[PDB]
């Protein structure tokens, strides 16, 4: 039987017997994602170039408006907005959404892959909506994932029962279920990070990457990959295995990536696929935020590889 | 005024007052690229998954058929085909085409950037056509370039008078002139290579990469990017500046990339944009081929960055 | 606020808080409509014509497979099938759907307008399903409507509270609501029928056409339009006003158009918009079918015009 | 072998060993036809209805056709249904051709999603005077090429020239016109007539009789069927594809007809003849009328050759 994202979400909703508010959220999110992809692939560009005589701003506008009009959300935290967004009373619902509307849109001049990342939280108190409702630990996530605008457009959706991958067919505007319940390899052969920052590496990271290149035994050295776009680099790790690092050093003791709308959804997708995601000191999903735009270090991927990193990291503790 | 790819090539053809055989070729190749892009973006994939009840092989078949049926070619070399292709007598024209129909289609499961790379030669010998007609050095190219199937679909077109970039507008299926007479930065700040082969690196490469991480003049360290797909890495280098390296290792004593339909078209675009491309001993475009699938090492990019590598290279004899 | 067809159906579905089975139905039907439209507009025709080396049949297969796999249907009557289709046990649900997957596709060689017409009924008995579940009169319709593949693709959806029109935006694959709670004019200025059949006209129709061309009270005469595809003509009647006639004559005492999947869903749309639809003797919606493929004559449109037709009609006994 | 319109035009242009001006012309028109098609299909309508928080279609269509032709460097006078006076292309962008076009015919009923179309006729500039409006006052006999885009259930381009008529189907996945029907010819005699019978009370005595013969044939053969979409491009292309007759004739209230000679009557007549059909005004051939005004009207009766002749026989009985 053929399966779409919309058919998938309704069947899970009927199993759980909810009211439908979460499904209205996800459907709005898919629709916004399809409009973003259309703009990213440059539909209608000939008109700007004079046939008859902004991209991340538009992206944030498509996601914002579609969520407000869903009548299912109450607080929206975005990489584009300095303060959290409070939905007006007439359009209010019960969910909290943290998103990066166009991850990697800084290097979009080289036609690099870009993506939309989201984490969806349930609102905990009945107090007036405010920023405090987005300050939950990654363990509290209801669902999370990302859109990859790569050679094709794919939506990866993680929930309690696991991770599923959907492919956008642009002829009809439908996400097609193509990979059910994916699990990451127990141990990989690729390591992923920016080695240009070598002089600033934490001493454990230095040794761990050295062990990937010069094994003390006779194993094969690892290969290396780094796109510079999180949605792309993390998605390769899921599909091929290996380790992804944007770690802490003395210059950025808390890392560079934002915890809420980058680190948490990817940590969630990883753990639901059998992987791990750590800061070195603790699991990313266990961190309690105190600011919506706060940073977190992250090392994620295959479990044997993260354990091997934690072994070196603790050796230097 | 709006300019398209077809209008651009027709304008250049009347300037040159040629017959139009090259125009029919370029038009045929552009049609093949618009077809491949539609396949890479998964248009119509919903039917494969039963809505009504290989990709690089297809890419190879689309480029093969459109070039044959243009009546403009006589020898065709492809990464998918073990031997060169001899075009039948009724469809022969005066040009020779070397192409990789879907470069990077190995990592196409991680939705990595993929692309089509091509190089165009006027047949040189008057002999009956054979594989020897594709063994010309890259200096002899009439035109060269690539389609990058990234976040959007772009065609980069290089010729004697320079490099032009066209953006595919899928709404109307037309390439739109968006970057006229493009030039690479004189010097960049990103380096690109697979550091997993560090244990097999030649001493010259070992030293040059050391200089990128720990600069001797206390300048800021370069950043590193490595997609693992040549079309993406080169286009990022072209759009931003910097250096791209795939040198030899123990597994590849003659280097890894293919000279005919990977290294040379990229050497041509670089030099036509003001960049450089070397193997260490000589310019890639100066290499005289003896076998159609032969390998070459390559270091290319911004002119100041490649000169700095060769300076280190001659230090080690 | 922007509204899509999917948002419209879920919000109405939550208004009634039904099980979700009818929503899973309409979502599947909408998905088939987008697929038909893409093939009707000739997406991918280059592959059929050998770029790398039926339409009503595919249309019927898309609607059949998408409805079966919705788990919301058990009996399906289609213009393409001699007998009704009984859904297999594991996929049986509670709704009955009548559809013409591609109305007017015989004249598709002149690129005339084509359309999909559908009506949805509820299962009548709790016994095992059979054809009798589709032999309901039009008065029982839960929903009905049509897609018009014209200069654009529009979905007109009629239900208890009235009729709404949605426009397919092909860039993103979403139906956008453009006309809310539509009503036809009380009286129009256009009549629509095949006047080449003048020789077989009932005396009443002849007189009614006489008064439109030569008004006895010197009002201005009506204009004439006749496309020859029912979905197109009916939609023109709704948008501009007037009357559409395919009536009974001595040769076809029961008309030409089919009652289940052409006449009934169109009569339903008209009445829900403030119009009328008659066979001359009674309302179309009051007709009891005895065979899934039985015919009925139809006169529909503006209320003053249907009454003026019946006025002449009753004078002639 | 697969054939596209761009490949087809480059091949014919190379046979004739021309300069390339006419191919650059048609290529610009094909692109204008694809942008119009994309707009008529309502791509991007979600932005007009507030999905993220303009021009009428005939204004955009006329702007698209105008801009692409000027920028082709192949034209010098442009007559459009939208513009009162002829347009003289500025000196730096002048070429040798004159184009009379209707950019979106039938766009009045576009609210009922009726078929719409683009009609065009191409002339070479004849005189060596500085270009002016008079350069468009040539009779239809002078056409280099003519045709139409029909934005119907699919988008098709019909191109007529000296050697005949060819049809291309737009594949929107790649944006290419694909040659699908080569060298079309209309049937010698059809079974469909096309005109607005609602205005019967003003009919000329012959048109009354001819339509009388089609509904109640004197030889008791089967009657013709009637079709009238109300949009010229859809109706005429149906005539070409299936045969029959299309009529918009003269009456006492409109002695010169309603349709315009330059950008409606002549291009449809030209396509008809190059496919084996006829097109007449009753008194003379459409292609033989010498205009004195670029927006002057003409009656037109066109379609299968045998069907048009039966009209002219009735026409002359009434002198
Ligand atoms: C928790 N989680 N995370 C993802 Cl990801 C997915 Cl999937 C998923 O599973 C649910 C759970 C609850 C809901 S819900 O609360 O919205 N319930 C409904 O929608 N019920 C319906 N009734 C009629 C129709 Br038709 S659907 C939706 C999806
Ligand atoms: C050399 N180079 N490399 C690229 Cl890339 C491009 Cl662009 C370009 O420039 C030419 C040069 C020669 C030709 S040609 O030899 O084919 N001649 C013609 O096409 N003549 C025509 N006549 C009428 C029309 Br209309 S076009 C085409 C393009
Ligand atoms: C009857 N009619 N005809 C048309 Cl046309 C339309 Cl609109 C319409 O309105 C309904 C009424 C009931 C249903 S239903 O029985 O399927 N119920 C639900 O779907 N409930 C849901 N719960 C959560 C989510 Br989310 S939807 C569907 C549509
Ligand atoms: C007269 N007519 N009507 C239609 Cl319709 C068509 Cl088709 C057609 O036939 C010509 C004749 C001449 C030209 S032309 O004068 O523009 N010549 C060229 O384009 N020559 C070329 N050289 C290299 C390339 Br490549 S094409 C264009 C089309």
UniProtKB/TrEMBL annotation, chain D:
EC number: 3.1.3.11
Enzyme class: hydrolase
Stretches that traverse the bilayer: none
Key words of the record: Acetylation, Allosteric enzyme, Carbohydrate metabolism, Gluconeogenesis, Hydrolase, Magnesium, Metal-binding, Nucleotide-binding, Phosphoprotein
Pathway: Carbohydrate biosynthesis; gluconeogenesis
Reactions mediated catalytically: beta-D-fructose 1,6-bisphosphate + H2O = beta-D-fructose 6-phosphate + phosphate
Binding site for beta-D-fructose 1,6-bisphosphate: 105-107, 196, 199, 227-228, 232, 248, 258, 260
Binding-site list for Mg(2+) 1: 81, 102, 104
Binding-site positions, AMP: 9, 19-23, 96-97
One Gene Ontology biological process: gluconeogenesis
Domain of life: Eukaryota
Keyword Zinc (UniProt): no
Example GO molecular function: fructose 1,6-bisphosphate 1-phosphatase activity
Boundaries of every Fructose-1-6-bisphosphatase class I N-terminal domain copy: 4-181
Residues holding Mg(2+) 2: 81, 102, 105, 264
InterPro entries, alphabetized: FBPase_C_dom (IPR044015), FBPase_class-1 (IPR000146), FBPase_N (IPR033391), FBPtase (IPR028343), Fructose_bisphosphatase_AS (IPR020548)
Gene3D superfamilies per UniProt: 3.40.190.80, Fructose-1,6-Bisphosphatase, subunit A, domain 1
Domain annotation Fructose-1-6-bisphosphatase class 1 C-terminal: ranges: 186-315
Family recorded in the similarity comment: Belongs to the FBPase class 1 family.
Quaternary assembly: Homotetramer.
NCBIfam families: PRK09293.1-1
Functional description taken from the UniProt entry: Catalyzes the hydrolysis of fructose 1,6-bisphosphate to fructose 6-phosphate in the presence of divalent cations, acting as a rate-limiting enzyme in gluconeogenesis. Plays a role in regulating glucose sensing and insulin secretion of pancreatic beta-cells. Appears to modulate glycerol gluconeogenesis in liver. Important regulator of appetite and adiposity; increased expression of the protein in liver after nutrient excess increases circulating satiety hormones and reduces appetite-stimulating neuropeptides and thus seems to provide a feedback mechanism to limit weight gain.
Record-linked HAMAP family: FBPase_class1 (MF_01855)
Protein name per its UniProtKB record: Fructose-1,6-bisphosphatase 1
Gene name of the encoded protein: FBP1
């Amino acid at each position: 039987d053929v399966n779409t994202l919309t058919r998938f979400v309704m069947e899970e909703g009927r199993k759980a017997r909810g009211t439908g508010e979460l499904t209205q959220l996800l459907n709005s999110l898919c629709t916004a994602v399809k409009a973003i992809s259309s703009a990213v692939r440059k539909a209608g560009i000939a008109h700007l170039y004079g046939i008859a005589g902004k991209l991340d701003v538009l992206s944030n506008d498509l996601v914002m408006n579609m969520l407000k009009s869903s009548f299912a959300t109450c607080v929206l935290v975005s990489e584009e907005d300095k303060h959290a967004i409070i939905v007006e009373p007439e359009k209010r619902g019960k969910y909290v959404v943290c998103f990066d509307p166009l991850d990697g849109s800084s290097n979009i001049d080289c036609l690099v892959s870009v993506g939309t990342i989201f984490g969806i939280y349930r609102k905990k108190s009945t107090d007036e909506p405010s920023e405090k409702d987005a300050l939950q630990p990654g363990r509290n996530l209801v669902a999370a994932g990302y859109a990859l605008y790569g050679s094709a457009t794919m939506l990866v959706l993680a929930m309690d029962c696991g991770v599923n991958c959907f492919m956008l067919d642009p002829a009809i505007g439908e996400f097609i279920l193509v990979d059910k319940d994916v699990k990451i390899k127990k141990k990989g052969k690729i390591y992923s990070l920016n080695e240009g920052y070598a002089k600033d590496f934490d001493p454990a990271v230095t040794e761990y990457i050295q062990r990937k290149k010069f094994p003390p035994d006779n194993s094969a050295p690892y290969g290396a990959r780094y796109v510079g776009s999180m949605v792309a680099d993390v998605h390769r790790t899921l599909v091929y295995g290996g380790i992804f690092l944007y770690p802490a050093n003395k210059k950025s003791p808390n890392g560079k990536l934002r915890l809420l709308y980058e680190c948490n959804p990817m940590a969630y997708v990883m753990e639901k696929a059998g992987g791990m995601a750590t800061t070195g000191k603790e699991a990313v999903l266990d961190v309690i935020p105190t600011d919506i735009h706060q940073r977190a270090p992250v090392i994620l991927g295959s479990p044997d590889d993260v354990l091997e990193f934690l072994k070196v990291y603790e050796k230097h503790s």
